[PDB]
């Protein structure tokens, strides 16, 4: 329980601001003014907060939690910018891999389960047809994805191992995650219980804390892009829409169900759209369906900016209160986008049971560990029509991907 949040204060508060916030809060919950249930405990909690924050010795080591996060991120930025300025190129060759099964299809190409012929290790190969990517006008999107993936490092991101290109295709070889997409397990289970949803949500929250500190917007949160690893922890895949953005950006991209209002509207937007999408993800995960569905995307768009959300009656009230603050059409009022940023979400009642450090360390017991039947089993993935892999004799689109 954050003491600064208890006294309603800025981490930087003066000692007089602490002594005045303490008198202001204790009045509101003093039993002389408040017999209602829980005022006894909130009065006790306001007492503890003033006792810690006004002793400079207790305040210094309580402040170490935020100082630790600050240092971790400062170092994570230094390591990212190193790889950002010198990205890895041409770190393998197609003939080094045995092609096994298609793991999914797209307008760009496909994803193939493959095996390294020397180490026998298994990998997910994203194959991208150069001509298509030109045809789909997704050239920058494909250079971004490779560039960002090779530079990030965080427990809940997929890991890019090698990348390279031939005369016809782009290749991105990432570590294989056998549990498959969250989408599959969610459609089949129906919905997760709130503690089950909170488990995944907390991982997404920490991952966005990391990405936003690098100035990265993710822009494609949805259950399809969340892989489940053997210990039941999330791996975020698909960075085709991710962009390094210091200020505003303007593109209409992503999945209709998950789009913040200001992406749909012509005005510009910032990384707050990722927190709106987190709201949509928690909703879908706990309800079994998204908060905004309809058959035409413009109908989805109308419901999105409409400002109205219906919650299932099994939604706990803390959960609805978190959701009301994330699915907030007014971005000057949306959680994650305020003075205290991500800590407004981490300090929220719905997360009170969350051990953020244990989650990051992956020490929390997972509520679901997918059916492990071998280091190269594909049961947790759907079945797609195979197709053979063609490579021209003449190099296609040399200039447009010379960077890759």
């Amino acid at each position: 329980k954050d003491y600064y949040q208890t006294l309603g204060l800025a981490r930087g508060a003066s000692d007089e601001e602490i002594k005045r916030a303490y008198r202001r809060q204790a009045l509101r919950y003093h039993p002389d003014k408040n017999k209602e249930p829980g005022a006894e405990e909130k009065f006790k909690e306001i007492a503890e907060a003033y006792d810690v924050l006004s002793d400079p010795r207790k305040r210094e080591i309580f402040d170490r939690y935020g100082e630790e996060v600050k240092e971790f991120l400062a170092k994570a930025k230094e390591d990212f910018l190193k790889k950002w300025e010198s990205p890895a190129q041409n770190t393998a060759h197609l003939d080094q891999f045995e092609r096994i099964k298609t793991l999914g299809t797209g307008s760009f190409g496909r994803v193939m389960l493959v095996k390294h012929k020397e180490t026998g290790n298994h990998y997910a190969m994203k194959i991208l047809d150069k001509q298509k990517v030109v045809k789909l006008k997704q050239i920058e999107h494909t250079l971004n994805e490779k560039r960002i993936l090779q530079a990030v490092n965080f427990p809940f991101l997929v890991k890019l191992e090698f990348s390279f290109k031939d005369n016809s295709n782009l290749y991105m070889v990432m570590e294989y995650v056998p549990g498959g997409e969250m989408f599959s397990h969610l459609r089949r289970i129906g919905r997760f219980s709130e503690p089950h949803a909170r488990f995944y949500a907390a991982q997404i929250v920490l991952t966005f804390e990391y990405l936003h500190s690098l100035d990265l917007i993710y822009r494609d949160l949805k259950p399809e892009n969340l892989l489940i690893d053997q210990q039941g922890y999330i791996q975020v895949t698909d960075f085709g829409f991710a962009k390094r953005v210091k200020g505003r950006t303007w593109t209409l991209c992503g999945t209709p169900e998950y789009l913040a209002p200001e992406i749909i509207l012509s005005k510009g937007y910032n990384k707050a759209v990722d927190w709106w999408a987190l709201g949509v993800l928690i909703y879908e995960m706990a309800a079994g369906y998204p908060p905004f569905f309809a058959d035409q995307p413009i109908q989805i768009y109308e419901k999105i900016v409409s400002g109205k959300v219906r919650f299932p009656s099994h939604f706990s009230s803390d959960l609805k209160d978190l959701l009301r603050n994330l699915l907030q059409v007014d971005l000057t009022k949306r959680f994650g986008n305020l003075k205290n940023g991500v800590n407004d979400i981490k300090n929220h009642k719905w997360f009170a049971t969350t051990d953020w450090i244990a989650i990051y360390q992956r020490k929390v017991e997972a509520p679901f560990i997918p059916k492990f039947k071998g280091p190269g089993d594909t049961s947790n993935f759907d079945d797609y029509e195979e197709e053979e892999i063609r490579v021209s004799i003449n190099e296609k689109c040399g200039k447009e991907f010379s960077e890759f």
Partner: peptide, 20 residues
């Protein structure tokens, strides 16, 4: 429920993105 109206629809499958 809305969950019944959901499986009564077709947006139950994997959602494709829009790149515009």
């Amino acid at each position: 429920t809305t969950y019944a109206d959901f499986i009564a629809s077709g947006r139950t499958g994997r959602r494709n993105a829009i790149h515009d």
